[PDB]
Design a protein around this ligand. Structure first.
Ligand SMILES: c1cc2c([nH]1)CCCC2
Length: 163
């Protein structure tokens, strides 16, 4: 297991524009296109992202390219964030993957609301952090994914995914 395999499980792979859990146009491996309800705006974002006229469909290679870019940008964003970098750098490699996964799903506006959880993670109070992480809109809206990510934060193992 690694961050790519983990996010591939959590995000799936779809080659046509679909709506994500929040109702937003998305493609590939959780590549958000737009929060606009206009499918035409989503198609324009897709074409811009891929560099050709896609008419709402991409190939697996193209999906994996966006995924590579999105994971890299997620990690780099963490390192550029003053609140997130010290917490991230305090973690072991497996728990770092849980952090990347969260940021990938929620963005940095989303994790902004996880400050208290962040402190507990930096303190390595794993069970307490796990309890706090579940007291969230995130958990309530995507509980089976959040449970996997939280187990990863709690244990520093891949137990929630290896199966
Ligand atoms: C839990 C810890 C961290 C996150 N979740 C997201 C950004 C990096 C630090």
């Amino acid at each position: 297991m690694n961050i790519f395999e983990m996010l591939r499980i959590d995000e799936g792979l779809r080659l046509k524009i679909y709506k994500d859990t929040e109702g937003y146009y998305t493609i590939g491996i959780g590549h958000l296109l737009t929060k606009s309800p206009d499918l035409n705006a989503a198609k324009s974002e897709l074409d811009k992202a891929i560099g050709r006229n896609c008419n709402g469909v991409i190939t697996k290679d193209e999906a994996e390219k966006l995924f590579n870019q999105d994971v890299d940008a997620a990690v780099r964003g963490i390192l550029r964030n003053a609140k997130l970098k010290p917490v991230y750098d305090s973690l072991d490699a497996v728990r770092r993957c849980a952090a990347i996964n969260q940021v990938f799903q929620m963005g940095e506006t989303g994790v902004a609301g996880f400050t208290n959880s962040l402190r507990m993670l930096q303190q390595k109070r794993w069970d307490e952090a796990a309890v706090n992480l579940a007291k969230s809109r995130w958990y309530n809206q995507t509980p089976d994914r959040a449970k996997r990510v939280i187990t990863t934060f709690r244990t520093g193992t891949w137990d929630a995914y290896k199966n």
